[PDB]
DNA sequence: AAAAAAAAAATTGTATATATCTGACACGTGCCTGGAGACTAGGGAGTAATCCCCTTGGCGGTTAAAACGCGGGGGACAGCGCGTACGTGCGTTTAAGCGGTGCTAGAGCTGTCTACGACCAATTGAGCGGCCTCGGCACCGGGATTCT
DNA sequence: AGAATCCCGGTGCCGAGGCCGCTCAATTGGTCGTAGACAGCTCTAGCACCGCTTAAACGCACGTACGCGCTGTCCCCCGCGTTTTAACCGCCAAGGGGATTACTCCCTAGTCTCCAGGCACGTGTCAGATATATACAATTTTTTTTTT
C-alpha cells in the first residue's frame, strides 16, 4: 500500500487548538494551508537529516537516537528523550 | 576516605567523570582538578535548578516534581532562561501571557 | 538583588503561606470540638469568624429565597382587602403572570396542549370582564391563559402563546391559530412552523421563540404595547411568579423608568423574588388561594373553564392537509 | 548491558537540599539531557580555547574561563568560588 | 450564551495549563511514513522516533504561533492573517 | 526648485547599497570601545584590526537589523519605523530573553 | 560617553537598512542596543585575553569572540 | 609524484593529513579520507570561484573584490543557505526596494 | 604561517587563466575553506562518536557532505570524491 | 431629566475535599567490574633574559562634516459607515484508540584472523621570506544620457 | 529646461605576480600491535489484523463584532542655507609587552593488584489518578440613587 493524502491528515480542529496554546484569539480562513506547508517542509527537513543519520550506521529502522541528533543538528536541542 | 568524590566533599563521581573526560577524545592528558571543578559546578546548577523545582512542586500542593514544573521554574528566572532559552523541555508547554490590549475596557 | 536576597523574600512568602493556610485550618474546626487553649488565634481573628458565619447566614438565605415561604391567613386576607381596594381604585392596571400560576396549571415552573386553564386564569379573565385589570403579561408559553378567555390584546407573552403562529414572509405578517402545540416539528436554531398560509400559501412562523434566538417579528407580541401599558396603569400587579422569565425581559415591566415617576407595583407569589422585597406590599401563599380571596373580597364568582367557553379552539384555522401526522402531539378538540 | 546514569547522585542532593521530596522518572530523564548537554559544551569550548593558546594540557584555569565564559554574573560569581573552595580543600589534604 | 471571546479565553487558558499531545498519532504517523518513504522503500520506525517527532513539531508549531501573535498584535488586529506568518519565517531567519 | 519628499531619499538609498566604505567615525568608535572595555579591568591596550573588526561586525548587524525592521514596518501597512518594530525584532531573534 | 554616536550616524547607518522616515525616540534604543551586543563581546574578548597570559587583546581574540555566537566574519586572520 | 599529483587534485593532502592528525578528532586517521575533503574543497571553491567570476565580469572587471563574491554568494539560493549566519567583510547588501514603497 | 594561496592560485589558473585577484579576497577564501573545514571534520567526529567507532574513515564524511550540502551539490561531491578516491587506490 | 457611580446578586469558571485502588517508586541483595594504592619514566610546563614592534601620545592644517533654523507638504491618526467572515451551538458521521494474537525481520553479542594504521630513521623538494617591476585601477575632469 | 548619473579619456601610483634562495616537512621504507569484516546464533519489538466503544470532526445556520475604506485634521520631519567644529592626515618620540630561547623541576600516563560501589532484579506499600460530589472568590452586569 502506498500513502498518498495524508497531508489534510492534520484537521482543522487540531490546528485551531495549536493555536490557541499559542495565544491567538481569532482565526482567518487561509491560515490551515499554510501551516500545513510550513509543517511540511520542516518535517522533511528531519526525516531527511534524521533518514541519513540512518543509513549512516548501515541500520534499515530509524533510531530516536538519530532524531535526537539531527534536532541537534538544526539547533533544537530536545529534552528528556536521551542523550 | 578512599573514594575521591568524599575526600572533596561532592555529591557528583569523580571517577566517572574523569573517565568521560579521557574517553571524549578532548585533550590526550587531563589535569587531576579538573573533574573536582567539573563535580562542584555540576552540584551548583543541578542545585538551583532543583531547589526552584520543589518550589514550584508546593505551590500547586505537590509532593513530586513534574517537567511541567521545572518548565515553570526555568521559564520564570532571568539568567537561566538565557542559559537554556534555547532548549525544548518535553510536554512543558508554556506560561499563561495575555496581551493587555486583548483584554476587553 | 542578591540570591540570598531572593533566598529570603521567598522565605517570608513561604511564612505568609504558612500563616494564612494555619488560619485557615484554625478557622475549619468548630469551635467547640477544640479545646480551650486552641483557638487563640481564632477567637483573636473574630473577623475572620465573622465572615465564616456571614458565609453560612447568606446561603441560608439564598435556600430560603428558593423554599417556598408561607404567610399567615389572616395578614393575608387584609392585604388582599387592601388589595382589593388597590385594584378597584385604579383606573388601568397591569397583572403580570407568574411561573407559579405554570405550577398551578401544571406548566414547568421557572404536555402544554392537554393543560387546561388554572382557576388562577380563570379569576385574571374575570378582572378583565371587569375591566379591573387593563393588561396582562404573562411568563408561561402554554397560551392557557388565551383559553381562560382573555382578550388577545390584553395579554402579552414574551416567550409566545405556542398555539399562535405568524408568518415571517409577510410584512405585515400572518397571524393563525394551532390547536395543538408545535414544540415537536420545531426545534433550536430553526424557526419555522412548517404550516402553510391557507391565503399566503407561505410556512407559518411559531410566536413562540425557544433558547438561543432572537424572534423578529413584533406583531406576535408587542414590547412596546406592554411598555405603554404599564406605564397607563395607576399601578402595577403581578401574582405567583418566580419571576425569572420576567427577569429576562425588562422592558415588559417597565423596570427602566424611574421607581418615583412608575407606578406603585406589588407582587405576591409563594416563592420569594427580588421584586417581593422591591414591592410595598408583600404577601406569601398560594397563588389560586391567593386570587380566589380577592374574588371573595370583590365579591364577584370565580368562573370555570370548559373547552367549548375556550377562545382558541374557535381562533383556531384548520389543519393543512397532511399536516396531522406531521405533530407528535394530537390536535385539541373543543 | 549496563548503562550508566546519575540517578543516586542527583538523588542524594534532592536529599540533601529537599529530604521530604519525591521524584518521576521523566524528570531523571530531562536531568540526565540537562547533565549531559552542559558537560559537553563546557568540554566543547575548554578544548577549543586549549588548542587556541597552543596548550597540550587541561587544567583548573582553562574549565574555570569556560564556566566564566557560558554563565552569567552572578552565577559565575558562585560557581567560581564553590570551586575554588572545592578544589583547595581537595588538594589540601 | 456567552459573549464572543469568553469561549476564545477559556480554551486559551485550558491549553496553557495543559500538557498532553494535541495531534492524534495515526494520521500523523501515516503523514511521516508518507514523507519518508520518498527516501528510501520499505523503512521501518520505531514508537519512540514518532513520539520525537510529535514533540518537536508541537514544539515549533507553538512558538512560531505566539511569534505570529506578536506580530499581529503589533499590526493593531486582534485577527490573525497570512502575511504575519510569512513575516515571522521571514524574519526569523529561515526560507 | 524643491524635490518632493522621497526623491532624494530614492537617490540616498541607491548610493548606500552601491557603497561599501564604512558609515560611521572611527575615532568616536575607538573612544566607545575603551570607554566600554575598560570596566572589566584597568591599564588594557588595543590594536587597530580588532577596533576595525568591531567596527564592520556591528556595522553588519546592525544593517541586518534595519532590513527586518523595514519588513515589519511595511508589514505594519507604514512606511515609517517605530521603536515597537525593533521591539518586535528583538522579540523573533531572541537575543532578548 | 554613550552620546559619542551622533544622529547624523545614525541616520546614515539606518539609511543603508532601508529605512527612509525615522522617529524621534529610536537613537536611544540604538544606542542601548549596541551597547549591550558590545559588553556581551568585549565581555568575551577579555576573558579569552586573560586566560593566555597577555596583558593586550588581539583581532583574532575578537574573531574567535563573533564565531562562538555564530557571527564569524572574514578578512581578519580567519 | 606528491599525493595531490597521483590524485589528481591541487589542494595538499598531507597537510589534511598532518592537520587531521593534530586536530584531536580521532586517535586515528583513515588514509583516502583526505583525499575526499580535497576533492570536495576544490569543488566549493571551483563554484564560488565561478560564480564570483561571472559577477565581476558582469561589471566589466578583471579583478576580484568582496562586493562580486557578495553578491555572487547572495544571488543563489544553496550558496545562501549554506552561508546563512555567515556576515562577509565588505560585502553589502543586495539592492532591494519593496514595492508599495514606490511611487504610484 | 601556513595558508592556503598557493593552492587556490592553481585552482584560478586552472579555471580562469586571464583573471587577477587580490590579497582581501584570498583572505574571505582562506577562512571559508577554513570554516567548511570544521564542519565537515567535527559533524564527521560526532558520526564517529555515535556508532560507537573509534576509526575515521571515508564513509563518515561522504555521509557529512550528503547532510550539510543541497542535493546537486551534494551528489556532484560524492561523484568527485568517490572517483578521485578510486583513482588514488588504482596507483600505488 | 439624563448620566455616572456604587452596591448587590448571579454567573463563571475556579478551586476543592474525599473514598478506592492501583501501579510505580523505594528499599534489600549479589556480584563484578571500574576505581583506588603504589612506583616509574619522561616530556610538557613554569621561570629568567632580550629586544624591537607596536601602541600610546602630542600638534598644526584643512576641510568635509556636523549642527541649527525655517517654510512646507505628505503622512499619521481618529472617527464613521458598512459588508462579511467567523464564533457558537446542535445533530450526524467517522475513525482514533484499546486489547489480544501472531510472525518474523532484525538488532546485539560472540569468536577470530587478517588487513591496516601507528612509529621511526633517511632524505629531498616544495613552500615560505625578500625584493622587484610595472601595469590595473583610482582620481580629477569633461561629456553622454536620464528622470523631473 | 534641468540637475543627477553613466561614460570615455588621460595620468599617476602602489599593490600583484615573478624570481631567488633556503629549510622544514612530505615521502620511502619497513615493521608490529590491533580494530573490524564476517557468520552465526539468538531474542525482541515492529508490523499486521480484528473487533468494539466512544469521543471527536463535520456540516449547517444565525448573528454580530471586526476589517476596511473614506474623510478630515494637524503636525513633524525634509531639503536647503549658513555657521560651527572636530576628523583625518602627516609627522615625530618613547616605553611596554609580545615573542623567542634556554633550562630544570614535576605531574600525567602507564602498569599491576585488589576491593567496594553501582547495577539488574524483585517485592512491598502508598501518593496520585479517578470518579464523585461540592464550595467559592472574582467579576460583571444591572439597578438604583445622586448630582448637575
Same mark, same amino acid.
Given at each position: 500500500?502506498?500513502?498518498?493524502?495524508?497531508?489534510?491528515?492534520?484537521?482543522?480542529?487540531?490546528?485551531?487548538?495549536? +493555536?490557541?496554546?499559542?495565544?491567538?484569539?481569532?482565526?482567518?480562513?487561509?491560515?490551515?494551508?499554510?501551516?500545513?506547508?510550513?509543517?511540511?517542509?520542516?518535517l522533511?527537513?528531519?526525516?531527511?537529516? +534524521?533518514?541519513?543519520?540512518?543509513?549512516?550506521?548501515?541500520?534499515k529502522?530509524?533510531?530516536? /537516537?538519530?532524531?535526537?541528533?539531527?534536532?541537534?543538528?538544526?539547533?533544537?536541542? %530536545?529534552?528528556?528523550?536521551?542523550? | 576516605?578512599?573514594?575521591?568524590?568524599?575526600?572533596?566533599?561532592?555529591?557528583?563521581?569523580?571517577?566517572?567523570?574523569?573517565?568521560?573526560?579521557?574517553?571524549?577524545?578532548?585533550?590526550?592528558?587531563?589535569?587531576?582538578?579538573?573533574?573536582?571543578?567539573?563535580?562542584?559546578?555540576? #552540584?551548583?546548577?543541578?542545585?538551583?535548578?532543583? #531547589?526552584?523545582?520543589?518550589?514550584?512542586?508546593?505551590?500547586? @500542593?505537590?509532593?513530586?516534581?513534574?517537567?511541567?514544573?521545572?518548565?515553570?521554574?526555568?521559564?520564570?528566572?532571568?539568567?537561566?532562561?538565557?542559559? %537554556?532559552?534555547?532548549?525544548?523541555?518535553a510536554?512543558?508547554?508554556?506560561?499563561?501571557?495575555?496581551?493587555? *490590549?486583548?483584554?476587553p @475596557? | 538583588?542578591?540570591k540570598?536576597?531572593?533566598?529570603?523574600?521567598?522565605?517570608?512568602? #513561604?511564612?505568609?503561606?504558612?500563616?494564612?493556610?494555619?488560619?485557615?485550618?484554625?478557622?475549619?474546626?468548630?469551635?467547640?470540638?477544640?479545646? $480551650?487553649?486552641?483557638?487563640?488565634?481564632?477567637?483573636?481573628?473574630?473577623?475572620?469568624?465573622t465572615?465564616?458565619?456571614?458565609?453560612?447566614?447568606?446561603?441560608?438565605?439564598?435556600?430560603?429565597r428558593?423554599?417556598?415561604?408561607?404567610?399567615?391567613?389572616?395578614?393575608?386576607?387584609?392585604?388582599?382587602?387592601?388589595?382589593?381596594?388597590?385594584?378597584?381604585?385604579? !383606573?388601568?392596571?397591569?397583572?403580570?403572570?407568574?411561573?407559579?400560576?405554570?405550577?398551578?396549571? =401544571?406548566?414547568?415552573?421557572?404536555?402544554?396542549?392537554?393543560?387546561?386553564?388554572?382557576?388562577?386564569?380563570?379569576?385574571?379573565?374575570?378582572?378583565?370582564?371587569?375591566?379591573?385589570?387593563?393588561?396582562?403579561?404573562?411568563?408561561?408559553?402554554?397560551?392557557?391563559?388565551?383559553?381562560?378567555?382573555?382578550?388577545?390584546?390584553?395579554?402579552? #407573552?414574551?416567550?409566545?402563546?405556542?398555539?399562535?403562529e405568524?408568518?415571517?414572509?409577510?410584512?405585515?405578517?400572518?397571524?393563525?391559530?394551532?390547536?395543538?402545540?408545535?414544540?415537536?416539528?420545531?426545534?433550536?436554531?430553526?424557526?419555522?412552523?412548517?404550516?402553510?398560509?391557507?391565503?399566503?400559501?407561505?410556512?407559518?412562523?411559531?410566536?413562540i421563540?425557544?433558547?438561543?434566538?432572537?424572534?423578529?417579528?413584533?406583531?406576535?407580541?408587542?414590547?412596546?404595547?406592554?411598555?405603554? +401599558?404599564?406605564?397607563?396603569?395607576?399601578?402595577?400587579?403581578?401574582?405567583?411568579? =418566580?419571576?425569572?422569565?420576567? !427577569?429576562?425581559?425588562?422592558?415588559?415591566?417597565?423596570?427602566?423608568?424611574?421607581?418615583?415617576?412608575?407606578?406603585?407595583?406589588?407582587?405576591?407569589?409563594?416563592?420569594?423574588?427580588?421584586?417581593?422585597?422591591?414591592?410595598?406590599?408583600?404577601?406569601?401563599? @398560594?397563588?389560586?388561594?391567593? /386570587?380566589?380571596?380577592?374574588?371573595?373580597?370583590?365579591?364577584?364568582?370565580?368562573?370555570?373553564?370548559?373547552?367549548?367557553? &375556550?377562545?382558541?379552539?374557535?381562533?383556531?384555522?384548520?389543519?393543512?392537509?397532511?399536516?396531522?401526522?406531521?405533530?407528535?402531539?394530537?390536535?385539541?378538540?373543543? | 548491558?549496563?548503562?550508566?546514569?546519575?540517578?543516586?547522585?542527583?538523588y542524594?542532593?534532592?536529599?540533601?537540599?529537599?529530604?521530604?521530596?519525591?521524584?518521576?522518572?521523566?524528570?531523571?530523564?530531562? /536531568?540526565?539531557?540537562?547533565?549531559? &548537554?552542559?558537560?559537553?559544551?563546557?568540554?566543547?569550548?575548554?578544548?577549543?580555547?586549549?588548542?587556541?593558546?597552543?596548550?597540550?594540557?587541561?587544567?583548573?584555569?582553562?574549565?574555570?574561563?569556560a564556566?566564566?565564559?557560558?554563565?552569567?554574573?552572578?552565577?559565575?560569581?558562585?560557581?567560581?568560588?564553590?570551586?575554588?573552595?572545592?578544589?583547595?580543600?581537595?588538594?589540601?589534604? | 450564551?456567552?459573549?464572543?471571546?469568553?469561549?476564545?479565553?477559556?480554551?486559551?487558558?485550558?491549553?496553557?495549563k495543559?500538557?498532553?499531545?494535541?495531534?492524534?498519532?495515526?494520521?500523523?504517523?501515516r503523514?511521516?511514513?508518507?514523507? $519518508?518513504?520518498?527516501?528510501?522503500? &520499505? %523503512?521501518?520506525?520505531? =514508537?519512540?522516533?514518532?513520539?520525537?517527532?510529535?514533540?518537536?513539531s508541537?514544539?515549533?508549531? *507553538?512558538?512560531?504561533?505566539?511569534?505570529?501573535?506578536?506580530?499581529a498584535?503589533?499590526?493593531?488586529?486582534?485577527?490573525? /492573517?497570512?502575511?504575519?506568518?510569512?513575516?515571522?519565517?521571514?524574519?526569523?531567519?529561515?526560507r
Amino acid at each position: 500500500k502506498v500513502l498518498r493524502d495524508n497531508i489534510q491528515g492534520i484537521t482543522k480542529p487540531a490546528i485551531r487548538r495549536l +493555536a490557541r496554546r499559542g495565544g491567538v484569539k481569532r482565526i482567518s480562513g487561509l491560515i490551515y494551508e499554510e501551516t500545513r506547508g510550513v509543517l511540511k517542509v520542516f518535517l522533511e527537513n528531519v526525516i531527511r537529516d +534524521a533518514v541519513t543519520y540512518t543509513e549512516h550506521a548501515k541500520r534499515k529502522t530509524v533510531t530516536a /537516537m538519530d532524531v535526537v541528533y539531527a534536532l541537534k543538528r538544526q539547533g533544537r536541542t %530536545l529534552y528528556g528523550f536521551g542523550g | 576516605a578512599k573514594s575521591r568524590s568524599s575526600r572533596a566533599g561532592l555529591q557528583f563521581p569523580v571517577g566517572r567523570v574523569h573517565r568521560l573526560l579521557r574517553k571524549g577524545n578532548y585533550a590526550e592528558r587531563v589535569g587531576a582538578g579538573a573533574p573536582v571543578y567539573m563535580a562542584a559546578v555540576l #552540584e551548583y546548577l543541578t542545585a538551583e535548578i532543583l #531547589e526552584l523545582a520543589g518550589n514550584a512542586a508546593r505551590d500547586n @500542593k505537590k509532593t513530586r516534581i513534574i517537567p511541567r514544573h521545572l518548565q515553570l521554574a526555568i521559564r520564570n528566572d532571568e539568567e537561566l532562561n538565557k542559559l %537554556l532559552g534555547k532548549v525544548t523541555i518535553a510536554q512543558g508547554g508554556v506560561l499563561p501571557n495575555i496581551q493587555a *490590549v486583548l483584554l476587553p @475596557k | 538583588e542578591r540570591k540570598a536576597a531572593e533566598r529570603v523574600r521567598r522565605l517570608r512568602e #513561604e511564612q505568609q503561606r504558612e500563616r494564612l493556610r494555619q488560619v485557615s485550618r484554625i478557622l475549619r474546626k468548630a469551635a467547640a470540638e477544640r479545646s $480551650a487553649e486552641e483557638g487563640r488565634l481564632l477567637a483573636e481573628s473574630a473577623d475572620l469568624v465573622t465572615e465564616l458565619q456571614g458565609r453560612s447566614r447568606r446561603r441560608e438565605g439564598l435556600k430560603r429565597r428558593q423554599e417556598e415561604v408561607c404567610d399567615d391567613p389572616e395578614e393575608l386576607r387584609g392585604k388582599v382587602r387592601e388589595l382589593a381596594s388597590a385594584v378597584r381604585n385604579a !383606573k388601568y392596571l397591569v397583572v403580570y403572570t407568574g411561573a407559579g400560576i405554570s405550577t398551578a396549571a =401544571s406548566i414547568p415552573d421557572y404536555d402544554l396542549s392537554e393543560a387546561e386553564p388554572t382557576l388562577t386564569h380563570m379569576s385574571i379573565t374575570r378582572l378583565h370582564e371587569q375591566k379591573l385589570v387593563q393588561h396582562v403579561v404573562s411568563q408561561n408559553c402554554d397560551g392557557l391563559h388565551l383559553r381562560s378567555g382573555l382578550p388577545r390584546t390584553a395579554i402579552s #407573552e414574551l416567550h409566545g402563546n405556542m398555539y399562535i403562529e405568524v408568518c415571517t414572509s409577510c410584512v405585515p405578517n400572518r397571524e393563525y391559530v394551532r390547536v395543538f402545540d408545535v414544540t415537536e416539528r420545531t426545534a433550536l436554531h430553526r424557526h419555522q412552523t412548517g404550516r402553510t398560509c391557507h391565503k399566503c400559501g407561505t410556512q407559518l412562523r411559531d410566536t413562540i421563540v425557544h433558547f438561543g434566538e432572537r424572534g423578529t417579528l413584533g406583531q406576535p407580541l408587542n414590547w412596546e404595547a406592554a411598555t405603554e +401599558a404599564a406605564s397607563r396603569a395607576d399601578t402595577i400587579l403581578c401574582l405567583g411568579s =418566580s419571576l425569572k422569565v420576567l !427577569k429576562k425581559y425588562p422592558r415588559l415591566w417597565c423596570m427602566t423608568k424611574p421607581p418615583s415617576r412608575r407606578p406603585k407595583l406589588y407582587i405576591v407569589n409563594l416563592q420569594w423574588t427580588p421584586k417581593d422585597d422591591w414591592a410595598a406590599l408583600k404577601l406569601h401563599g @398560594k397563588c389560586d388561594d391567593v /386570587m380566589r380571596l380577592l374574588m371573595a373580597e370583590l365579591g364577584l364568582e370565580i368562573p370555570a373553564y370548559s373547552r367549548w367557553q &375556550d377562545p382558541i379552539f374557535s381562533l383556531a384555522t384548520p389543519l393543512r392537509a397532511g399536516e396531522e401526522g406531521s405533530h407528535s402531539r394530537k390536535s385539541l378538540c373543543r | 548491558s549496563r548503562k550508566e546514569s546519575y540517578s543516586i547522585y542527583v538523588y542524594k542532593v534532592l536529599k540533601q537540599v529537599h529530604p521530604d521530596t519525591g521524584i518521576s522518572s521523566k524528570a531523571m530523564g530531562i /536531568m540526565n539531557s540537562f547533565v549531559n &548537554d552542559i558537560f559537553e559544551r563546557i568540554a566543547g569550548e575548554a578544548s577549543r580555547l586549549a588548542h587556541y593558546n597552543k596548550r597540550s594540557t587541561i587544567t583548573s584555569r582553562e574549565i574555570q574561563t569556560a564556566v566564566r565564559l557560558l554563565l552569567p554574573g552572578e552565577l559565575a560569581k558562585h560557581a567560581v568560588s564553590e570551586g575554588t573552595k572545592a578544589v583547595t580543600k581537595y588538594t589540601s589534604a | 450564551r456567552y459573549r464572543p471571546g469568553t469561549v476564545c479565553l477559556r480554551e486559551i487558558r485550558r491549553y496553557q495549563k495543559s500538557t498532553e499531545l494535541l495531534i492524534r498519532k495515526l494520521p500523523f504517523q501515516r503523514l511521516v511514513r508518507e514523507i $519518508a518513504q520518498d527516501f528510501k522503500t &520499505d %523503512l521501518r520506525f520505531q =514508537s519512540s522516533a514518532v513520539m520525537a517527532l510529535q514533540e518537536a513539531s508541537e514544539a515549533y508549531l *507553538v512558538g512560531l504561533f505566539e511569534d505570529t501573535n506578536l506580530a499581529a498584535i503589533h499590526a493593531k488586529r486582534v485577527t490573525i /492573517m497570512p502575511k504575519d506568518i510569512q513575516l515571522a519565517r521571514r524574519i526569523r531567519g529561515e526560507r
